[PDB]
C-alpha cells in the first residue's frame, strides 16, 4: 500500500520565560519514530521506534544539528510574525508546520506537502504541483514573495521529490517488520441502560494496525452513520490503535442491530451483536 513520512513541527513563544519551546515529531505512516524537544536537558534527536537503532551515530548528530538549525529559524519567525501582524512582545504565539511525502507501494512519489499555521490558523501552503505557494493572508503573501525571490520552492521540491522519498524508502526497509505488519482488530459490544426505554450499544475495535478502520452500525441492512457517536481512532500505547462507535436503540430490540468492522487485517469484515 502507500506510505508516508511526516514531520509535525511546533514553536511556541513564552515571553518572560526564556526561549521558545521547539519540537519536531516524525512519523512513518501511523508510527512515531523520531523526536526533538528543546525542553529536554540536553536536547538531541532521539529514536522513538526500535528499528531506528539501525541508524549509526552520524545520523543522530546530523539530524540533531538540523533540528537546532530549524529551531533558530522558527525563533526568528516568531519575531518576524509579530512585525507582520503588528502584535506585542508580551503574548504567546504558536507556529505549526506539517511537512512530508507519500509514496506508492512501488516506492514512487505520490505527493508532497508542507503547510504552516500561525496561532492555529492557515498561514502558507505549498501547492500540489510543488512549484508555488498559496498564502492565506497578507502576512503570508510577504513570505511567499520572499521565498519566490530566494528560490525556496525549488529547494523544497528537491527535498520532497528526492531526499524525503529516499529516506522514507530506507525507513520502510529498515522497519519492515513493524511498518509492513498487519494487526487484526478484536471486537466486542458493550451495553448501557438509559432513561426512557432505550439502551446504548457500543462497538469496540482493539489491537489493530494500521490505524485506518471503519466501524458501522446497521439495522435492516442499512448503515446508521447519522445516529452514531464515535471517537477518533486513537493510539493505545504499544503501537496499535483502538476505536469505538455507539448507537442508541430501543430496549428489547438490541438483537436487530449489528456492528461491522472493516480493516486490512480482516479478510472478511467482522459482524457482531450484543
Amino acid at each position: 500500500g502507500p506510505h508516508s513520512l511526516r514531520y509535525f513541527v511546533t514553536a511556541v513563544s513564552r515571553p518572560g520565560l526564556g526561549e521558545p519551546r521547539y519540537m519536531e515529531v516524525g512519523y512513518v505512516d501511523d508510527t512515531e519514530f523520531v523526536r526533538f524537544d528543546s525542553d529536554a536537558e540536553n536536547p538531541r534527536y532521539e529514536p522513538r521506534a526500535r528499528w531506528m537503532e539501525q541508524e549509526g551515530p552520524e545520523y543522530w548528530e546530523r539530524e540533531t544539528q538540523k533540528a537546532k538549525g530549524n529551531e533558530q529559524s522558527f525563533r526568528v519567525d516568531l519575531r518576524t510574525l509579530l512585525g507582520y501582524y503588528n502584535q506585542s512582545k508580551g503574548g504567546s504565539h504558536t507556529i505549526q508546520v506539517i511537512s512530508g511525502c507519500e509514496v506508492g507501494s512501488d516506492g514512487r512519489l505520490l505527493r508532497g506537502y508542507q503547510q504552516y499555521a500561525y496561532d492555529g490558523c492557515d498561514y502558507i501552503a505549498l501547492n500540489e504541483d510543488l512549484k508555488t505557494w498559496t498564502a492565506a493572508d497578507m502576512a503570508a503573501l510577504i513570505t511567499k514573495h520572499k521565498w519566490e525571490q530566494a528560490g525556496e520552492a525549488e529547494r523544497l521540491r528537491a527535498y520532497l521529490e528526492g531526499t524525503c522519498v529516499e529516506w522514507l524508502r530506507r525507513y520502510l526497509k529498515n522497519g519492515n517488520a513493524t511498518l509492513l505488519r498487519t494487526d487484526s482488530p478484536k471486537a466486542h459490544v458493550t451495553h448501557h441502560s438509559r432513561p426512557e426505554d432505550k439502551v446504548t450499544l457500543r462497538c469496540w475495535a482493539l489491537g489493530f494496525y494500521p490505524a485506518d478502520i471503519t466501524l458501522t452500525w446497521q439495522l435492516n441492512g442499512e448503515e446508521l452513520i447519522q445516529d452514531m457517536e464515535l471517537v477518533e481512532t486513537r493510539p493505545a500505547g504499544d503501537g496499535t490503535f483502538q476505536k469505538w462507535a455507539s448507537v442508541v436503540v430501543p430496549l428489547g430490540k438490541e438483537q436487530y442491530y449489528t456492528c461491522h468492522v472493516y480493516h486490512q487485517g480482516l479478510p472478511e469484515p467482522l459482524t457482531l451483536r450484543w
Binding site: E63, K66, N70, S73, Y123, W147, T163
Partner: peptide
C-alpha cells in the same frame, strides 16, 4: 530526515 527550514 526532515527538511532544513528557512525563515518566513
Amino acid at each position: 530526515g526532515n527538511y532544513s527550514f528557512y525563515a518566513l
